[PDB]
Every structure is written in C-alpha cells, then in structure tokens.
Ligand binder design. Structure first.
Ligand SMILES: [Mg+2]
Ligand SMILES: [Mg+2]
Ligand SMILES: [Mg+2]
Ligand SMILES: [Mg+2]
Ligand SMILES: [Mg+2]
Ligand SMILES: [Mg+2]
Ligand SMILES: [Mg+2]
Ligand SMILES: [Mg+2]
Ligand SMILES: [Mg+2]
Ligand SMILES: [Mg+2]
Ligand SMILES: [Mg+2]
Ligand SMILES: [Mg+2]
Ligand SMILES: [Mg+2]
Ligand SMILES: [Mg+2]
Ligand SMILES: [Mg+2]
Ligand SMILES: [Mg+2]
Ligand SMILES: [Mg+2]
Ligand SMILES: [Mg+2]
Ligand code: NA
Ligand code: NA
Lengths: 54, 145, 118, 49, 160, 151, 125
RNA sequence: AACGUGUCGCGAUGGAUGACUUGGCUUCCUAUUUCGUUGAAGAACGCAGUAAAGUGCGAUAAGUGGUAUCAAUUGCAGAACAUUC
RNA sequence: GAUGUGGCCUGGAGGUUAGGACGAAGCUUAUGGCGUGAGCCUAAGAUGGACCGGCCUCUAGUGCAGAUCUUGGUUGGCGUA
RNA sequence: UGGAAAUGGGGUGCCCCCACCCGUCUUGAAACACGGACCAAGGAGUCAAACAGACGCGCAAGGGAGGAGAUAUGCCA
RNA sequence: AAGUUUGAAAAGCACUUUGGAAAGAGAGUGAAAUAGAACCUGAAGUCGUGACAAAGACAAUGGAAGUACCUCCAUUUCAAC
C-alpha cells in the first residue's frame, strides 16, 4: 500500500552510481582532514617564506 | 554525591566483578560474603560493608568498611578481629555493628571458615603421609634471602 | 615503527644481499663487547662462534659460510651424518650464536671503530 | 500536545471537513484541483458529524 | 566496481537442460560455460557490493558530547566505579588522585617509574603489562597483533 | 599400515601393492576367495584358474555376467577366470612367501589371515560419442594388502 | 560435600526434538527446525508424525538445570574461581573448562578438595 | 546359505575445515614527477660453463663504466682486488 | 501476516576477564549432562600442532535442503551397453 | 569397595499398536501437477538520499549545523 | 585451473632381502613418516575389511510404549549407613 506519505522527488534517475557498467558521478569528502592539514601546513610554510611580511 | 542506588544502577549489568557463566550470575568481589550478585552483597559498592575472611592458622578475620574514608582506597578497609577460636556469633556481632542486614550470612560464613580450616588440616595431614611414602625424583626449593 | 606487518615481512624476505648481511648479525662475547664497546656484529666467514640455542647448543666452531639465501651460517664443527654416513653441514641462524673471535681485516676494524658507543 | 505539528498533520487532508496539513516540502505545490472551486472541485471545509 | 563482472557472460536460454544463469562465453577453458555474474556463482559478483559513500562518520551534538565528558569525569571521581571498571586502585591514597606538578621536570623513564611506584599506580601498570598477548583471530593478520588493558591515565596541564 | 594386525607378529608375513593397475572389481573377487586359505592351497587355486579348470567366484561384482558349473564349489552360479588379476595376486603371494622365508618361517604352514582390496585413485581417459560428445573412459586400479600367519 | 536435596526430577520428555526426515539425508543435522511447508504432516500435527517443541514441555522451575548428582554446573577456570563457590558449595558444582591444562588442573583439584567444593569433572577418588 | 541390511573398530578414496599469507581491495599523502624522428610504446629474435619457462639484458647481451658497501654467489661448477680491480 | 524475547548462533571492533607445549583452533563420537528449542558444556581421541574462550557494548559480505541454483568431488546404473 | 549393586542416559534387534513424499503453486496434492542421485564450500531485503510515525537522548522559543579556521598539534583521518 | 603449506635442519629413508620394474618386507633419519616429496591439518559423501546384531516376503525411513542383549557413559550407594 502507499498510504499518506509525502510525494517523493529524490531526483536520482541519472547514472550517478558507479557499477559494472557506469563510471558514476560522485564526490566524497574522505580527504577533508588531510586537505585541512595540508592547507594549514602550506599557510605556515608561506608565512615562513614571506617573513616578516603579513 | 553519588548514591549506592545510582552506582548499582550503573554497574548491575556490567562490572568486572559480575561473573555471568552459563546462566548463573555470581560475584568474585572480595567483599562479598556470598558470591551473589545483589546490591545488598556488593561490598565494593556499599557505603558500609563487612566481610568474613580466613586468616593464618585457624584464625578468622573480619574486614570492615566504616564509610568514613571511602574516598581513600588504602584506608577504606580495616582488619578488626584476626582472632582464633572466636564464636561464630562473635563474628556475627562484629559484622552487625556496620551492617545488621548482613548478620545471618556472616555468621554462616564464620562457621564455614572454621569447618574449612579443620578440613584443610585433615586433608593436608593425609597428603603429607602419602607424600612421605614416595621417592619424588624432583623437588623445587625457593631461593631464600 | 613499521605500521604494516605485510610490508615489514616483505622487506625482510625480499631483502638484497647487503641488507641480508646486516640482518644476519650475531652478538659479541662479553670480552669482545668490553674490548670494542660494540654489542653485535654481522657474521662473516672465518668467524669463531659458539651456539646458544637449539640442539647444537654449546658447540664451538668456525664460520665456513654465510649462506644468506637460506638465512643460515655454516659452522665447521656442527654437522651430522646422512644415510650413507657422509657428513653435511647444519645451518644455524646467526641470532642463535655468539661471536667469540672476530676475523679482522682493516675494513672490519674500520666498522668496529664506526660502531664504538663511546 | 494538541498544538503539535504531528497532530496537525494527522488524517487525510482531502476528505470533507478535514483541515489537516499535508506532507509536502513545497508549500506552493498542491494548491490546485481539489482545493479551489475553479479547479474541478474544492474539498469541503465542513461536514456534519 | 568491476569485480565479478569482467566477462561477456550471456544466458543460454531455456532450450537446453541447464539453469538460466549467465554463462561465460568461449571455449578451450575450464571456465567455458560456467555460471557468471551471480552472487551465487563462483567468480561472480557479490550481492549489493560495498561502496565508499557508506556513512562512515557521525555528527554528535556539541552539548551531548560535553555532557558525556562531564559524566565520565564525575564517574572517575568515584572509587567504586573505578574498581568496577577493572583498575587496581586498592593501594592508591586518594581518589581523585592529585599529585605535585614537579613530575613535569622528570627526564628519565626511571624517575617516572619511581614516581608511579611511590603513589601506587604501579599495580595498574602491572595489570596492563601482564595482560599483553597476541590478539585472537584475524585481527592479528591485520596490523593489530597485540592487545592489552588500558591502565592509568596521567593528565598534565599542558603539552610539556 | 594394515587395517588389522596379526595375532602374533613374529609368526606372520606381510605384503601389499598400491595402485595395482588391475580392475578393482575383478581383483576384489580374485583376492577375496583366498582369505582364509593355506598359502599353498591358494597358489594351487590360482594356478588352476589360469588353467581354467577352476574359477573365481564372483560375489557382489557380478551384475549380468555368465553362469558356469565351476562356480558350484563356491556355492554360486556366476564365476570368471580373470587372468590379469590372478597373475598380479600370484606375484603378491610370492612376495608374501619371500617375506616369510626371510623371517625364518615355513611357507608350507602359513595361513592367509587377512585380505583387503580397495579402490585406488582413478586414471582418466576419454571416449568419443555420437553428436560430438566427449564422455569419460576411466581406469579403476586397486590397492591390495594381506598378511598370513603360521598355523 | 552433599548437595541440597530437591524433589524428584521429572524430565517431561527425554527424547530429543529432531528435524523432520533428517534420517534420510546425510547433510541434514538432527537440530530442530520448525517445519513451514504448507503440506507438512509434522506442521499439521498428524497423529503418527514427530512432535514439535512448545512451552508445555518446559521443566519444573524447582528442578530445572539440576544435574543428576544434585548440583548445578558452574564453569570455573582457575583456583581463584573456587572461592565464589566456597560459600554455596551445596548448590553449585564446578566444571573445569576443557581447555584448562593438566598442570593448572592439578592445582585446581587440590584446592577444591581442600575447600570441599565439588567438581563435576575432577579426579575420580 | 547366498546375496543383501544395520552398528561399531580399523583402512582407502576424496581434498573440505582450521591455523598460516612476500597477494588483492579500499583510503590518504609527498614531488626540480609525464614518452617519441637524438626513433617511442608495442612486436620479433637472441644472450649464462651448465639455462625450457620466467626474470634481466642486447653481438660489450642473467651484463660494461662509476660511487658507495665490504666477503660472497651457491643446484653444481668456476674464480679467489679484501687498506677494496 | 504483525510483534516480542538479560532468546540461540557466526566473522571483526572498543572494553573487561581468562585459558594454552602439563597441548589453542580445527576434526571424530552407542559422550554424557543441561535447555521446550535455537544450542551450550563436559568427557575421550590409541586426533592435531599454536593460538584462543567467557561477559558488556559496537559492527556486518552474519545462520541453507531444494532456485532444470554455482564450483569441486563422489555415486547407482556397471564389470553393464 | 568390586572384573559391583543400583538408577538414568546411549546403542542394536524384536513385539503390539500408530504412521501416504518433501518443497511449491492452488478452492483442493500422497497425487498419473512441477523441482527433487549424494556430499562439501558458496548462495538472495543491501547501501545511499528525501519524507513521515513510534521509541531513546540533548537543548528549548529556540535548536542545529555545514563549510572553514584556529592551536593543543609540529601524533593526531 | 593452480598456495610448492614435508620438516626446526633434507637429517629427502644408506644397507639387507624378493621382484624385470614399479614396489613389497625389514632396517635407518626424525619429537612425529597416518610428516616420505606438488608430503600440515585431513571433514563429509562413497568404498574395503574384521567383529557383532540380526533379518522372510509388510519398500525403507518415522511415532509411541515396552522388552532382550550390549554399554570405552553419567550419577548414587556400600552398616547402626
Ligand atoms: Mg537530477
Ligand atoms: Mg563490462
Ligand atoms: Mg572472486
Ligand atoms: Mg548382455
Ligand atoms: Mg566415436
Ligand atoms: Mg565431431
Ligand atoms: Mg532433553
Ligand atoms: Mg493446505
Ligand atoms: Mg631460456
Ligand atoms: Mg508466517
Ligand atoms: Mg566480514
Ligand atoms: Mg551472504
Ligand atoms: Mg526451506
Ligand atoms: Mg500450477
Ligand atoms: Mg487448478
Ligand atoms: Mg504437497
Ligand atoms: Mg491421480
Ligand atoms: Mg511451473
Ligand atoms: Na551446504
Ligand atoms: Na627415533
């Protein structure tokens, strides 16, 4: 039965999911902490390089 | 600050003293006169506690938690009888000073400790004679200093 | 250290010959440790070693081969007979022996100078 | 508890005399046939019990 | 995403007296005509293959995690709960145990050892030392060879 | 090494052969008949089977084989003369006799006390059938072990 | 030690509840499985078929888990484990774990004999 | 009684299970990190005292030169600057 | 068909407790005991050779008798055609 | 106090009574309805997203991020 | 398809004996050859063999109650008990 639910519009119709036949179209964020650490290390390195300029 | 009620609610299902083996829930708490896993018998938990233990020889020892120094684990428990040949009722009255609700079980435990000491004497003598009959190709001697 | 068992074991079992030479080291005796202040040393052909572990424990002899492909050293004194009664060397891991006498070439003394802890 | 959003959403909103809110993410959707006299019909605001 | 599916593998149909599963094409090979692609087939694709966009991480309300830390600290102020957790604190002087700040001036592991023995933390450290063993099961093949208990935790005012 | 043991091992002789390359069913029949026989009686029986004056009784591996009057001495109607199994078993009995002689036992007194024939690992050949079918053509070799004891 | 006395053990049923037709298929273990086949004569309770387990077969609360000797089996692994049995030693017996080795077993049996703690699988004498 | 049934002890056939993993899969990072007519990628044929495959190499062919390293390689054979040929 | 179960079971994780060369896992059983049952536990190996049990919580590619199911092996027919 | 007496369990045979083949679709299967030689290992309600209801937890006219920065922090996703 | 995963070392079974050989019987090595070479463990299914139980033809299996015989099982008792 369907019952009383919201009318769904989830918009997942396009080949977004990678599988045996599809490359997929996805973006995960698993590298988020490593990229945060890299950005901070890079800022520290650039501050070291351009000392004493702000 | 934190009552025995709350601590019992916290540790009842899960505790290093709860021994749930087969379907039986026993306790290996040193201050439990029974081995039963109940709030009454949890000597490690209760504010005041007393446990009957055996001592060297035929002596019977009573360990008492008086609740005055529960924040100091080294001072928390005090040895108070360590006497040999005491009446089981005397141990029972020593225990009842802190916990009257533990009187019967501690009396029975005093009697059981006495029985165990005499039985151990008999078994040890028999084993000693049996040993005296045997050659015993090896014997270990602990180093002394 | 090496967070991976897989990689550590691969680097050990696929090691090159000079790395295997380093991996196949044996402790020095108390006297040699005192003389050189070096704890252990890679085993070399014509070293004198006494066995400390295994069935040949206590046996003293001279090193005749550091095989390095079988991870064993061959000692002239430790051996056994085949079915036909001839003799065959028995390989021992160098970590089970102790060097009592070093073969000293000039470069060996140089190595010992490099490893002097004082 | 009678002012709760779940209470406000209970029951079919398209039956006569019902004033429950529908489960809809888009407020502007669902404002047509079934809710206006000029769009086919309008659900009746009142029905005698 | 390609594992188990790297084959041509068409179904033979119902004409022949075999099951309708897709079968590997070609000849001259032990896998010619074998079942393919199916979760029940050898060399086939697993049912519902695992993905990397599974929800690995959790967000927890900031107040709830502060509440949890606070409750844990209050629990550590209770000697009965501490021994119930499994620590050996039957010799320590006081709980909560507070020591002088001068242990931050130690330089050798030997002095820290002497200090642990002095305030009777050495019993719990010894419980941990004796608990060391090889992990049971597959975890030892992974980079998790040894297990041990937790032991005492020494809180410093800073990173020095 | 053997599924059973002689009652007295100093008065016994053993022999076995592995992956014999005789037919397992025929060898089963040929070896089983000598199980409780004196060694000389067994050797005479095998010599007479080679001469086709006596037969090997075929019990349990006799589906649709011929009937013969020589099977009556065994209480059967079906028997055969499997020369290949017979010569292999004669060789095995010669080996047992040699083992007995080495041990200083009299072969004229030895009684066969144990005979076991088992199916060994099969060797594969193929055969070609109508409509381009390839269908198996297997060989069924056997293991045989026996020992005999002085009466 | 003597166990505390209980009433007669009844044991309503001593036959096991075995899986339907497991005697006919070597791979089927006798472990019970509730038959769900629509025509199953066991599920439909035909008179001559195997019985199915249910709540009315449950043992008397008073004699449940009591072994024939009259003790209740408590698993123990150590010498120290005997001390929680020392007080209720007319109710619980100790079962030494199968993996406990022979040396530690010697120690356990000596201590248990001293304590008068019954062991289900100790030394015969 | 003969086939044939059952149960148990012991054997065979057969390679499951368990422990073991120099493999796979997945995630993250670091860089003076991106081939070729100065002939690449890929194909082919050869090369060892003994050498099918594989690996490595190219008529200088299981390798030449150099810098480190220091006593082997190893199935056998063969060789025998060590303060580094 | 719905729901419950300090209900059973399996591979891993955080904890806590144990066990193992005086023999772990696996495997064998006219091998008993316990449980209504899923199963648990002991005994014996004249088995094995090195790991692993319990309890609380977390987690998943977590439980088979059948799908003309997949792969490997075996098998009566058959000493037959 | 033993080549043991008991009781219980286990095993095999026998007796008298009972007793149609499992799984499935179907109003109806023991069916002359279909799938069914044996065993091993493998084998099927998953993950993600939107919404709702129940139940747990925190805070409450307010709740909560996210992204990202900061520094403990240069071991520590 | 296919782990070479024997064993800590190859110590990889000299030598005797019979056989054309393959191998067998002995003897050795080894802690262990049911560790003997694509050799750790070695399941199920199927098969051989020995001992036993019996058994008409009720296909076999199955239920429930006994009984005969067995039982490398458990538990209890063994005297003022
Ligand atoms: Mg879209
Ligand atoms: Mg494709
Ligand atoms: Mg695969
Ligand atoms: Mg014919
Ligand atoms: Mg043809
Ligand atoms: Mg053709
Ligand atoms: Mg029962
Ligand atoms: Mg019906
Ligand atoms: Mg070549
Ligand atoms: Mg249902
Ligand atoms: Mg998994
Ligand atoms: Mg699955
Ligand atoms: Mg089913
Ligand atoms: Mg139909
Ligand atoms: Mg119909
Ligand atoms: Mg039906
Ligand atoms: Mg009909
Ligand atoms: Mg149909
Ligand atoms: Na299966
Ligand atoms: Na020996």
């Amino acid at each position: 039965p369907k019952g009383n639910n919201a009318i769904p519009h989830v918009h997942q119709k396009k080949h977004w999911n990678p599988c045996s036949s599809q490359k997929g179209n996805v973006k995960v964020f698993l590298n988020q902490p490593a990229q945060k650490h890299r950005r901070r290390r890079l800022r520290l390195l650039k501050a070291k390089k351009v000392f004493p300029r702000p | 600050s934190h009552s025995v009620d709350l601590q019992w609610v916290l540790v009842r299902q899960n505790s290093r003293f709860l021994q749930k083996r087969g379907g039986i829930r026993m306790s290996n708490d040193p201050f439990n006169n029974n081995g039963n896993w109940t709030k009454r018998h949890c000597g490690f938990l209760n504010e005041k506690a007393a446990v009957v233990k055996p001592a060297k020889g035929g002596a019977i020892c009573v360990t008492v938690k008086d609740g005055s120094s529960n924040n100091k684990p080294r001072q928390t428990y005090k040895k108070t009888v360590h006497a040999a040949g005491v009446r089981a009722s005397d141990v029972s009255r020593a225990v009842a000073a802190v916990r009257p609700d533990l009187a019967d079980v501690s009396f029975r435990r005093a009697r059981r400790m006495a029985c165990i000491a005499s039985r151990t004497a008999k078994v040890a003598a028999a084993r000693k004679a049996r040993s005296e009959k045997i050659k015993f190709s090896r014997k270990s001697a602990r180093a002394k200093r | 250290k090496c967070g991976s068992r897989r990689k550590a074991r691969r680097a050990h079992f696929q090691a090159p010959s000079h790395v295997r030479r380093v991996l196949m080291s044996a402790p020095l005796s108390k006297e040699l440790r005192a003389k050189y202040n070096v704890r252990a040393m890679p085993v070399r052909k014509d070293d004198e070693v006494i066995v400390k572990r295994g069935t040949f424990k206590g046996r003293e002899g001279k090193v005749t081969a550091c095989y390095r492909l079988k991870w064993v050293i061959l000692i002239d004194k430790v051996n056994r007979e085949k079915a036909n009664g001839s003799t065959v060397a028995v390989g021992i891991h160098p970590s089970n022996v102790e060097i009592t006498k070093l073969k000293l070439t000039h470069h060996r003394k140089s190595i010992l100078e490099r490893k002097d802890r004082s | 508890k009678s002012g709760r959003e779940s209470v406000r959403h209970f029951g079919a909103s398209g039956v006569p005399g019902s004033h429950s809110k529908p489960y809809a993410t888009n407020r502007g959707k669902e404002t047509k046939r079934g809710r206006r006299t000029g769009r086919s019909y309008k659900r009746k605001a009142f029905r005698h019990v | 995403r390609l594992s188990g599916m790297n084959h041509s593998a068409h179904s033979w149909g119902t004409g022949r007296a075999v099951a309708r599963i897709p079968r590997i094409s070609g000849g001259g090979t032990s896998t010619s005509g074998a079942g393919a692609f199916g979760n029940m087939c050898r060399g086939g694709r697993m049912f519902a293959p695992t993905k990397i966009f599974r929800r690995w991480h959790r967000k927890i309300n900031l107040h709830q995690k502060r509440f949890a830390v606070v409750s844990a600290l209050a629990a550590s102020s209770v000697p009965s709960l501490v021994m119930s957790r499994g620590h050996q604190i039957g010799n320590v002087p006081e709980v909560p145990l507070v020591v002088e700040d001068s242990i931050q001036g130690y330089e050798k592991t030997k002095e820290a050892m002497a200090f642990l023995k002095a305030i009777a933390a050495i019993d719990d450290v010894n419980r941990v030392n004796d608990s060391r063993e090889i992990r049971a099961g597959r975890g030892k093949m992974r980079n998790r060879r040894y297990v041990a208990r937790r032991g005492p935790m020494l809180v410093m005012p800073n990173n020095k | 090494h053997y599924s059973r043991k002689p009652q007295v091992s100093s008065k016994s002789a053993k022999a076995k052969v592995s992956d014999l390359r005789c037919h397992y069913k025929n060898t089963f029949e040929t070896a089983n008949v000598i199980n409780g026989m004196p060694l000389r009686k067994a050797q005479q029986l095998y010599r007479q089977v080679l001469a086709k004056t006596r037969c090997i009784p075929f019990k349990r591996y006799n589906g649709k084989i011929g009937r013969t009057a020589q099977a009556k001495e065994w209480g059967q109607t079906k028997g055969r003369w499997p020369r290949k199994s017979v010569v292999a078993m004669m060789s095995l009995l010669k080996n047992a006799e040699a083992n007995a002689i080495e041990k200083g036992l009299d072969p004229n007194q030895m009684v066969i006390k144990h005979v076991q024939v088992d199916q060994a690992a099969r060797m594969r050949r193929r055969t070609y059938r109508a409509h381009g079918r390839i269908t198996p053509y297997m060989c069924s070799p056997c293991h045989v072990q026996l020992f005999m004891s002085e009466k | 030690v003597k166990p505390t006395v209980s009433k007669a053990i009844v044991k309503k049923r001593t036959k096991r509840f075995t899986r339907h037709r497991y005697e006919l298929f070597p791979q089927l273990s006798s472990s019970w499985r509730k038959p769900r086949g629509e025509d199953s004569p066991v599920r439909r309770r035909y008179k001559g078929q195997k019985a199915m387990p249910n709540k009315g077969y449950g043992s008397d609360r008073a004699t449940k888990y009591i072994t024939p000797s009259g003790f209740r089996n408590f698993p123990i692994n150590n010498v120290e484990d005997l001390y929680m049995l020392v007080m209720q030693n007319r109710k619980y017996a100790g079962v030494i774990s199968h993996t406990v080795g022979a040396r530690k077993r010697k120690a356990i049996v000596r201590k248990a004999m001293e304590l008068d703690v019954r062991l289900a699988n100790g030394n015969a004498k």
